[model samples]
Target chain A: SGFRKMAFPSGKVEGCMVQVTCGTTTLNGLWLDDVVYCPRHVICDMLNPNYEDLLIRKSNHNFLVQAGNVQLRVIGHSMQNCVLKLKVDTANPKTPKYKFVRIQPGQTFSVLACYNGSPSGVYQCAMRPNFTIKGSFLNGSCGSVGFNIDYDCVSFCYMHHMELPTGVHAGTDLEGNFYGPFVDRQTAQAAGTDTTITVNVLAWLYAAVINGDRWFLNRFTTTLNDFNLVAMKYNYEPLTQDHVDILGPLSAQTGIAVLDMCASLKELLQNGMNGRTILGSALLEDEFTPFDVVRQCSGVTF
Target chain B: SGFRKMAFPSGKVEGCMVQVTCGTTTLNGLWLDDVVYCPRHVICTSEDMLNPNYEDLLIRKSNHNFLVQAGNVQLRVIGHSMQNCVLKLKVDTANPKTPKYKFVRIQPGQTFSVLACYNGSPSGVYQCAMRPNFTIKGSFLNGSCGSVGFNIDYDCVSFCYMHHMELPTGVHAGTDLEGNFYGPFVDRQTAQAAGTDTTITVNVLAWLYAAVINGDRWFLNRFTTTLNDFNLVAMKYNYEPLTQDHVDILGPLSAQTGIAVLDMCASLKELLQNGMNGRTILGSALLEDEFTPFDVVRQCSG
Candidate 1:
């Protein structure tokens, strides 16, 4: 026998640790069977060192080292060359797969991957065709290179008040897939039904910003429409302090802000009803309408 | 004497509800002892109706308006429409003598401001309940309002970084007008002079708001410089002193490994520099220094 192999009590000689020097850096590596696995970064650090010169010969372990141009390989590991692939497991929805695109030496390719979910993971590889990835994913490999990956998981609840008819409610799955129009909100709540979605921060933020814009538009418009209805219901007659006191308690059905804004709007309506010319009331402090309040609250100068 | 004052079992003739008409609106009023108390907004509604005319049905002495002044908070209660809404202002104190929820009847449209202060007496929850079952609760503690729970030591200045938009309304030095600096120094000189025991915390929200609203690049630059100066100071005062050559090596390594050259914290820069020279190892005996910079960038972006 050329050399006796070290064995564990489990009867497996997985590998042996060996010191290897790449340029001036010495690192411990594993020599297993016919392959010598060295740290990818350590090998890449030596710059343009000959691949054969970085290895040691012990008996007949003919280890094949795969190497490439140091500069080109370094460029491959940059953001431009890095590819982050997300395979959303719609079957499970909760878990999504991730992987890096492999490119042969001298090959050129680029692709953009967009994810709609919570902030999930950032993956990076340090070797020939080095790459970096940032997004949500389930599992995958970065090949035979040194790689790093970190991830965070989360679930969310989305309430859709205007979706179903009044007095009806519904539920949704972890992916926000909606289902069922129950009898009422309390019934749905008692049944432990909810509209929860699991996603990364990327998707959640996008949804939140979009929803905020929609909410502002909808609430502002609807409140104005409701005020118009109130004006029409009262026959557009000049609203006196008596009218405000009686209507104020009823307007509480909407909201306090709505009540306050309506009160201000009523004064403007009274000014108009009194046949005050636009120019006369243009500078009048009492002529401020509900819209003026909105602009003021939003920090938007007329 | 005819009705024996309709006293309760506790021998206290509090008041009786009497129907009264103001203009065309009829409402309930309180008739106590020798005074008749009507609503303010109700009387104000019949403006120009002789004050003495309405005063016949009102308390001749003064309106029975409630007032409570505790620390920086002032709670004023006045009747709006002859009906008083219930208000409960609860303060959790070291000694439990008074009721947890102090009940008072307040008139609608009358408002109160809950001022925040350090170790203030009114450090608890305030709730308002009105007819039609409307209720709202807010908390004030440690120089801020709307805190989740009562904590005498829970400093709001510490959390001001996240709520810069709400508290103080606009940008103030990392501290409130009360002049309490929340941890990490506001300037480079202060950070440099900081001792070993001082923890580092940045007013990220203030800088971010400044960048967005004022479009001031100086805040970002100062933020980066402050972090770097703090790092250098910490390394000098707390840990082993780093050599100039070592710092130089770390700066380039940090810049190369995704760390913003301008914004990279000095500690992470040094860590990468030491990591490259095989001087230090982190996380599972592998040199995971590259990802540290990326993580820092992600957090700062968030």
Candidate 2:
């Protein structure tokens, strides 16, 4: 067996548990439930090593999910890749293929388990170079296929600045409730839900800009690009008539810092410090908005 | 329209335009061909107000730097840590505004790939210098600068080890004053040979964790893994704690692997654990154990 099994030590069973040592220092730790269950890539806590217990099969050039909605055919039959398709088993064999869900290499997602002798009631459909879906074909095709992930135990985390103690979540609930990039925007817009939330932070700034949500865009841009927050804190005089008299110059400087940051936060303000032109031609179009946030912010009465 | 389009009163349309308001600094704006080309994403000036029309629209593209082409060579830079060192070009040696890309993620003591001459007169020698700040430039050319050169000096930076250089304008690819560091390189190459791809085997878990703490997704994506294994081999040898042994091990390991050794490990480990589960979990006794790092390194260095 090429697999090198390293048993999780009793104390190391939690997701973020690790013994970190660099130079003269060493730190050992545990993890948080939400962080472990985060649904984003690049920062999510490790899933169970056995997450990929599901047996997906590939017949012809298409990948078959025999476990969930079992017949959902995925594209990219290459040995190490596959993408989820919108529809499977059309009346004709030449059905057009569309990919909405893709499991990149070293990534995995779970589905309900319907096979005998399966380790658990849920199996992981992981994408790895060495393992073929055929390894899971033993459980055979579904009596049709199951589509719902009503019982999937694992959670995926989104990209977040790990340094911050709190982060905006980047995932959707089972009902397709958008929970990622625009939760703040969505909640602010009173939609009570999001159609989509792009994780590209720069584009989000652009959407705010083009949509004319100056107040919000003004704050978001300044916060991310400048250290005005410190200035905002430093010049904290109580709002009083006499205090205002004392605040004349100090308050002006603090407010000036914020206004200056707002001016500077515009994409490409001081050259491309915050990536002004990264979006390419998609940015040039007349109706150019990568996500619905453009329309969302525009709809705001404020 | 679900569009909620806000027209910039002075100059408005859609997409990349905005009516920037910052106190008394009300922006004056203008047009794109006949379309009300807005200026939202950034505070556009009279210069940008003259939007390039259809015939000249393609001209607007020369401003973007996601990709760069010199004569016939085109390079794709879809989100990498850095560029320019691999593909620096100067269309005119005499022009201070000569557009070129220079420097990539340069570290101290490493010989970067030679800069190749792509365009310009093709045979003149050029001097290149790194600046402490953006203004102090061009002590680089000891020889009269030709059209091309390679920047092979040792590279170092403050906390921001990774940075980029934009092309076509102040394309001088070197250091900056904001604590950015680059040394005065002694030599230059008016011409160079070629380059290719190779495999880099790494211990992904350790490397990935390092990248995570550093908040560099590009570093993670760029450093693809092709290999791995670990401890139990430690029992066969004398156990050395990682901290004391780290410098010793990293020197040899970096030498063999061509990776630079930076001593921010202990500092980084503390920050990495400070969030997601604040660092209260560590036992004082464990922190007192000085050689635990060496022992772990010995066990983990396979």
Candidate 3:
């Protein structure tokens, strides 16, 4: 009854009919599976599509996490909020897990069910009472006033880019690259010896200029605070001559003033400059140019 | 009664008479009670004061190599007191155990020094037995000659010995790792002869300091470690005594401390897979690079 009916061509009725529906739909009340002798169970507030508001500006939002699956969404922004704290505590299997993040107003974050691909787990969401993003320190936690975790879900998810999630320790091996969050500063340094930290802002600026990557350039620092949080987590250093070195040529080529890029690089390095971050190449592949002749002649690896 | 007597010219000289012996003397029958011990045993021979002949002949060892020997003699008749007193030298229990004795002769004053000799392979020890006879104007000194003991072990591959190689004495020039020119370096033969894995470890350190500014230390370490590991295996099959001439050379070559052994297994295993017999260059840059390490072994060993 919910799907629309389709009529055949005529009494001849030889052709197949195709029906397409594009919209969210749900049952009006709770659906039950309390079979008389099979089982006794009640599932209340079961959304058919497993949907919830994009947990943004905090107050507490419920989101569904399917086992060994992925989700695409964003944490919205507001005057008094910038981070979404969502977490799931594996320690207390009965209790809820939550996470927090600062995201571009519309930029989607990838939520991945990474805890050993287990079945459904609950996830609660929280937000900062004030729009403040600190650098290396994770200063915000649930006990802070107004921060609460009261959401129900079938599973848990950790935020990630198409690449690794922020704060991950990764490096190259014979087979391929590997990564994860640091277990401790000790192991992190060992991992640091191997991995390369991408200078995101500088790389973004570089890509923007090199091929005129409009998606990157047009939104070059468009959401500064959103990216500020990103650099703090991923890039892990303040601006240095290294950052300036990349942009110098590109800035000259594109006639883009280095002032803003430099300032942003400085901002990132100033905020995140610390021992845990490893510095390495932004590019992963081989390079060849007429300028390579000069480099080779000079015997430079770069 | 065997003493010679002299008469005084003046009667006043008769106050005291001195007796002097001027005749040959020998204790009758063997003195059995003369128990002999050699805390210091020295015996000298009287060669011809009338002789002029080079007894030591440096026979052809190879193109430029030499095996020194005390030669067969053609003693020229001198005074009527001269007689053949042939002596021979034995360099341990080698193929030539006994020397053929013939026209040997020694006279009054000329002395000879014994020399050790070897065969074509240069794999024998060095020794001399100058237990020789002598002749003079009056009597023969039959028991005068004493043997000289000599022991010398040499590896023809050692570039340090000019007999096996020819380089200007002293550090007159410097050599390069890659193709380049310098003095006091005998060519690839010299470098290969001396620059072992241990040698190259020191050289790698040297090249890093002298040439490689901001060098790839990991590559350097891998190169040395690979060589050391290879040597650990190949040494048993080596023909000569195991030595760190490279170690000896570079040990003083550096002023730094803590020189470590290298792993040459990666290099030598490939070398053995190519050829287990003798020196042969495997074509191709990579295989050559792999075999060149064995070139060090070949140069030092062969």
TM-scores of all predicted structures:
0.17, 0.17, 0.16
Cα lDDT for residue B97, candidate 3: 17
In the range A143-184, model 3's lDDT, one tens digit per residue, is 111111111211111121111122221211111111233221
Off by over 4 Å in 3: A1-224, A234-249, A252-302, B1-255, B263-302
Q: Write the per-residue lDDT of candidate 1 for residues B108-136, one digit (tens) a residue.
A: 11111111112111111111111111111
Over A56-148, each residue of candidate 2 has an lDDT whose tens digit, in order, gives 332322222221122333332221111111122322221112112323222223322112211111122222222111011111111101111
Error of 3 at B158 (Å): 30
lDDT (tens digit, per residue) of candidate 2 on B196-263: 21111112123322233323332212222111101122212222223333445445433433444332
Q: After superposing candidate 2, which stretches have Cα over 4 Å from the reference?
A: A1-85, A90-169, A180-302, B1-212, B216-240, B243-262, B265-302
Ten-residue stretch with the least lDDT total in model 2 chain B: B1-10
Residue A256 in candidate 3, Cα distance off native in Å: 10
Give lDDT tens digits, candidate 1, residues A1-302: 00000000100111122233334433332223322333332332433444234333211212222121110011111111111111111122112222222322111111100011111111111111111111111111111121111121111111111113221222222122332332212222322321111011111112222222112111322244455565665343223344335333323433433335454444543443232222111211221122211221222210
How would the docking of model 2 be graded? incorrect
Error of 3 at B110 (Å): 55
Residue A110 lDDT, candidate 2, scale 0-100: 30
Show the colliding residue pairs in model 1.
A77-A130, A96-A138, A117-A200, A117-A201, A117-A203, A118-A199, A118-A200, A118-A201, A119-A200, A119-A201
Among incorrect, acceptable, medium and high, the docking class of model 1 is incorrect
